[model samples]
Target: VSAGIEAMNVFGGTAYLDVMELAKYRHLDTARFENLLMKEKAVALPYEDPVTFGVNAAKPIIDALSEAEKDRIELLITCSESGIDFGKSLSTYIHEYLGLNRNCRLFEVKQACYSGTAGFQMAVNFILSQTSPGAKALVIASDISRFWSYAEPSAGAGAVAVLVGENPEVFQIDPGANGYYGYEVMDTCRPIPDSEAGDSDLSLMSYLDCCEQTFLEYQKRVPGANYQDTFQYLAYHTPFGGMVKGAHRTMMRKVAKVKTSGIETDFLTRVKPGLNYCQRVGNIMGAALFLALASTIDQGRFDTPKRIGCFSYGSGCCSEFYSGITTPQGQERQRTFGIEKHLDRRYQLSMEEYELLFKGSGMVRFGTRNVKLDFEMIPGIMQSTQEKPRLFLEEISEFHRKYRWIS
Candidate 1:
C-alpha cells in the first residue's frame, strides 16, 4: 500500500494577536518589534484548547469525505505539546468528537514542534506497512505556544490535519527518500505548566545545525540533489519567517559553499511564495512546518509535477528532510481550497485585548469544585450531542474535563 497526504486542512480561528502590540506592552524596542513584524503580523487561535484546535482542523477534511471514505480510516493520531490532560490520549477526545469509526486505533504523539511531522510520518508508515487495501489514517498536529516574557511574541496557536491513504490526491510520498538527524540538547523545554524556558540563541543554532546535517544526508540518499534547482519550492519549520530566511542562507553556504551577506535573488524567488502562512501566523509550534506545506500547496505557483522540499525540526531536538511531488489535479484542488481567505477574515485584537488574552489563567489548581467556564479558561473537556459544538469546553468538574455540543 502506498501512503501520502490525500487531503489536508488547517484551522485557526478569528482571534488574532499582533506582535507590534505585544512589543509595546513588554516595553521592548519598537524597531526590534517592527523587524519582527516583517516576519510575523499576528497569530490566530480559537477560544479553546488543543482538542478544539484538532477538531477545527479535521472537520473540513472529514466533512469533504463520503461516509464510506470516513469509515475506511483505521487509525487516528493527534500530536501536540500543549495538551489538556496528562493521562488520556488527545486522540480519544478528537476521535469521539469527530465521530469516527470506533474500531480505529488512536494515540497521541509529542516531540515538541516536530511532533506533527512525526505523526504524519507515522500515518504514512502505517498506510505503507498495512496490508489492507483501503486502510487510511488521520493525523492532526495541534498546539498552542504558551509562554511568557520574551517568548510571548513567538507563542501562537493553531492546528493542521492530514489524511493519509493509498491513493494520493494531493502529494505522493517517496517512502524510500528521506533524511533524519537528532541531537541531545536542551535547546528548549516547557517545564512549567503554562510556560517555556530556553536560550533563543542555542535553539536557533540547533535549528540550522540540524538543517545542514539533514540536508547533507538527503544529498547522500538522493545523489545529485540540488538545493537551488532541484525543487520548485521549499518549506521549513518557521518559528518566524526571518528564521526561514536564515535557514535558506545556511543551506546556500553548506550546499554552494558560499558566505554571502544576503540570499541570492534566484534562491529567494524559489522560496518566497511559501512564506504566506508563516508570515501571518507567527509560530504554531508543532503545526508550523505543515502549515507552511499547506500554504505552499495553496499558493498554486509551482507547475504540475513539481517537487517540493520539506524540512522539519523539533526542540530537544530532532530534524528530518523529506520531499513530495505535486500533480495537476492536486494543484487545482489546492488553488481553490480558500486557505488564504480563512486567514484574512480573522478578528484582529488590539494590544490591550491581546495582553489580557495572553496572560490567561496564569496558574490554577485542578479538581477544584467551583470551576467556572470563562473565555480565558483553557478548554477542558468538550461535551455535546450534536456533530458541531456550541461551546468547545463546557466545564471542568473534579479535575475531569467536560464538553458540550448543540443537539
Candidate 2:
C-alpha cells in the first residue's frame, strides 16, 4: 500500500508489504479463497511458500514500524501447517532474516493449521504481561501448504500479520486466551512415505468431517460466561471460503439464532468483509480467519468497539472457539484497505505454474534467499513445484524418514 505515506514509525514509516499472486485477474480467482478451493490435482500448483507468504505479507508492517518500536519488539512467531523448513523453526528464520529486534524472542508453532491462532494468543500474553503500552509485539500467521486431494481442491494458502500495541485499531487482544477449548481428533496426518517420499501426500476426508463435528461439540461448551451482553461479530478458521458459510448455515438451520452471541452469525458477518480475498485464495488453515480478519479491516467495514467472536478449527481434528473484544477503535480499516491494495499488485501464476509450485511439496531443507519474482507466491505456500521446501503434510506423508530437498 503506502510504503511511506500512512504507516507506523517502526522503520520511520517507510515499509511496504508487497503482495503478489500468480494468476490472471478474473472472477474465478475469487473462488480460490472460497469453498471451491484447490482440487487434489491442483495441489501441485505454483504458489508462494508459507514462510515467504508471511514474511512478504509482513514487509509493509515491518517497514512502517519505527526503529525504536522495532528494537523493543520482544518476540517473533511464525506458524503454519505447511512451511519451508522441516526441522528448523520458521519464526527463527524470519526473525533473523528480517533483522528483527535483536533482543526479541523467536519461535515457530505447528499443529494441523491451528498453531497460527495459538501463536497470536501467545504473543498477546507476552506483550501484555512483559511489554508496556509503549512496547509493541509482532505476530505473523502464514500458511501456503495444502493437501492436494482431487475430491478436495479446497487447499489454498496465504498469510496475515497483526502488529500489537497498547491500542491498535486492528483487533487487539482481550486479555484471556481461555474459554476457547482444544481437543484432539487425529482426523488428518501427513505420513511420509519411505519409498518415493515426495511422490505422494496423504490426508483423511474423515478428518475434515470430524473437524466440523468436533467444532460443534467444542462450541457448545463455550457459550460465553456473559453471552447476553458480550460480543457482536463472529469469525472462523476458513479452510474454504464457503466452508464457514456451511457451518453458519447449519447453525442457523438447527439452533435458534442469536444476535452476535452465537459463533455462526458473528463469523458470517465478519466474513462478509473479506469475501474478495477468500474468493481468490484457498483455505489457509491457522492463518485463514486472521487473513480474512485482516481483509475486513483492510477493506474498511467496521466502527470502533466492534466485538468479534473468533472460532479457530484445525484438522488434527482439534477445535477451539474464542471471543475477541475489538479495541476502542475496532480495526484499522484504513490501514487494512491500504494493505489489500498492495496485495492486489502482486503477480499471479497460471494453473500450470501453480502446480509447479507444489513440486517440492515436502522437502525439509534450508531455503536460500533465492526467490522467483515472476511466480505469484501464496504467502505460506511460497516456492514452486520445482523448488524444495518443508511443511507438515510434505514431510509427514508417511512419518518415517523426513522429506529431503536435495536427496
Candidate 3:
C-alpha cells in the first residue's frame, strides 16, 4: 500500500450542448434571459446508465497518460448516484476497462455531488496506508443523469476524472491538507420514498444549506495557513452558477473579520471572476470544482503554485474541504484541456429544441439497447449541426435529456 497521494490532472466531460440554442429553437419566453447563466448540459445519458457513461467518458483521458504512468494506476473508484446497477458502484466497469492489477481494490461512493470527494479521500487513504510510497490511485467523479427528467430540464450531464499518485502534473495535494467532513440533511436531496422509486423535487434552499455549513467551518480554520496569502482562488461545486456565487459571497463576509490588511481583501476579489463559468453551465456534481479549476487554468495565465480551495458537497449529504496547488507548468498544460473553449463555442438551444432533445417521464422508451447517440436527425442547413455522431446503445432513463439530434 502507498500513503502519499497527489493529483496529476483533472478532466471535465460535457456534451456538445447549447441551452440558448434549444431555447431559440423552442422559442421559449424571452423573459428568462436573466436565467441564461443558469443553463446546463443540453444532454446526458439515461439515469441508470450514468455510471457506465461517466466511466466510458473518463477512461480515455486516464489511459492517455504515458505508458509508465498508466502502469502506476493501481485502483479505480467511482462516485455517482446514477449508476448502471443500483447495487454496484460504477468502478466495476472502470476496473475492467482500464485493467488495473488484479490485486487492486474497487469501490463506489454515493452522497450526491460530494461522493466524488469521498472517492478521492478514500483512495488517498488507501495509498497512504500501504508501506510503499510509490503506489497510485485513480478517482473518478461522474454524474450522467439527473433525477425527475421532465421537471429539471435545466439539468445537464458530465464527469471528471483525476489520477492520484506520488506526484505528476496539474495539481499537487498537500499531505496535511484539511480532510473530509459530512453532514446529514433532509434539505436538498430528492431521495425515493421507501415505497416509491423516483426522487423528490429538488429544493434550492436545501442545497444552499449543505454548502453553507461547509463554508462556515472552512472559514474558521483557514487562517493557520495564511489562508488569504496561500490561496488565490476558490473552486466550488457548482450546482448552478448562483450557488457558487452564493458560497463566495459567504466567504467574503464570514471570513472578513480575520483579514488583516488590504492584500487579503484584494485577493478575494481576484478569485471571483474565475467562478463565473459555472453561471453558463449547470452542475456536473462531483466534478464541478475540479472542472471549474481546469477551465480557469486553461483560460488564464498563472505563474505561481497558485493555491486553490475546493468544496465538495453531495446531496444525501456530505461536504468536504481540501487544498490543491497548480503544477510547476500547470497553466501551459491546461491549454490542451479545451473544455472551456468547447463549452463557449457550442450552440445554445431553444426551449422547443431543448424539449425535443430532452427525455421526459414516459415520453422516451427504454431497454438495454433502446438508446442511440446519432447526430443524423439534425439538418445540416439549420443552425444545429448533426455532423458529429456518437451513441450509447444502453441508457438509464429518469430525467429529461434533450439533444438537437435524434434518429
Candidate 4:
C-alpha cells in the first residue's frame, strides 16, 4: 500500500565552472561573491536541452530495472520549463530514448519551477490510485540554465529522475501531509526563449513570503508538526545556497521562534546537508528540491527513520511544504550510484570558454528547424565524454532532433 520513490538518480551536465573564479575574472568583489554560497555550476552545452538531460538522468534508473519492473512504469512525466516544442511534449522524446513500454502514458508539466513537484505529486497519486495494479511512474525534472545577477554563478543545468512505486524505498511520503500554495506573481519570467527577465528584489521577497506561508499551512494539516522538532533535516527549493541559508534563518526566527543568536547554528546543522549538491551544481529550476533531498540522504546520518521537511517554491509562483521518511537502508541504496563521483567527472571551463559558450548559447534557439550540433564546440569535453559515453545531441533534421551516445 506504500507509494513513494523506489529509486532516483541525477544527471549533472558534462561541464562546470568555478563561480569564484568567474567572479574574479569579471573583477567583482570577492566578499560579495560569497553571498551566493555557490562554488561550481554544471553547464549545459548548446546541444543539450531538456530532453537530452531527461533521458540521461532516467537512463540509469531504467537500466537497473528488469523487463517486468521497467514495463510497470505506466506513467512517464517530464517536468521542465525548457520545452523544445510548443505542442509536442518533452516526455515523447524522453519516452522514446528511454525505450519505455508503449503502454505508458507520457506528458510534460509546467508551473515555472514548481513543475517538478507537480509532476512528482501526480505520479505519486497515480501509484496510490492503483487504477491498474502494479503500475509505476517515472518523474524526471530536467532544465537547462545558462545566472548568478548573482543568477549566473548560481544558474545550473541538471535533471533528477525518480521512479515512483509501491516500494517507497528511497523516500516514503506521508499521505495527505502536504501544505500547498499557489498564486500569481511576476517575480521571474522567461519572456523570451533565450532570455529570462526578473525583478531580483521582488523575487527574494516573494520567495521568503511563500516559504513561511506554505509551512504554516502544512502545520494546519499535520497537527503534531513542529518546525524545530518534527523533522531532523530541512530541504528547500534552492535558487542558491545563500538563499537557502537566508530562508532557513528567517523561518527559525519567525516560525520556530528561535533566538537570533542560535538561528545561524540551527541553519548550519539542519539545512546545510540539503545545500550540498546545490552548492556544487547551482540552481536547476524544478530539479532543485529533489537535488536537495538527494544531498540530504547522502550527507545525513539516518540511523533511524528521519523525517525530512521540504519546501518547494517556483517563481510565477507556487509553493508546497511536505514531509517524507528516509530510512538508513534507503540511504545505503542511494549511495551505490555515487552521485558525488558523477558530479566530479564534469569538465571544468575557463572564463574564456564560459564566456564564449554563453555568447554562442543562442546558436540553438527554441525553434530552429534544422541544424547539426557542433561536436567540436569544446573538443576536450567531447573527447572525455567518449571515455565515459553519455548522450549528446547530434542534429535536427527538418525539425526532428537526433541524439547520439558520445563517449
Q: Largest TM-score belongs to which candidate?
A: 4
Candidate 3 lDDT over 27-67, as tens digits, reads 66645544435655535523224544455445545546776
Cand. 4 Cα-lDDT: 0.86
lDDT of each candidate versus the true structure:
0.74, 0.49, 0.55, 0.86
Per residue, candidate 1 scores C-alpha lDDT tens digits across 33-97 of: 45443434444322366777788788877878899999998899998988766778888989988
2 or 4, greater by lDDT: 4
Clashes of 2: 71
Writing each residue's lDDT as its tens digit, candidate 2 over 334-363 gives: 454365454443335454444444454323
TM-score for each model: 0.90, 0.67, 0.75, 0.96
TM-score of 2: 0.67
lDDT top scorer: 4
Model 4 ranges off by over 4 Å: 147-149, 385-388
lDDT of 3 at 209: 59
- Model 3 misplaced stretches (Cα beyond 4 Å): 1-17, 20-36, 45-53, 99-101, 146-153, 193-223, 258-269, 276-280, 342-353, 359-391, 394-407
- Candidate 4 per-residue lDDT, tens place, 1-407, comes to 88898888888888899988877887777887667678898899988888888888888888889999999999999998888888999998889888899999999999878899999999989988989789999999999975235567768899999999998878999998899998998777887776688676688888889898988999899998899999899999997888788888888888899889988878878898888999788889999998999999999889999999988888888989998998988998889778898888788998888887887677778878878878778767777744445677888888888988765
**Which wins on lDDT, candidate 1 or candidate 2?**
1
Ordered list by lDDT, greatest first: 4, 1, 3, 2
How close to the true structure is residue 40 of candidate 4, measured as C-alpha lDDT?
A: 91
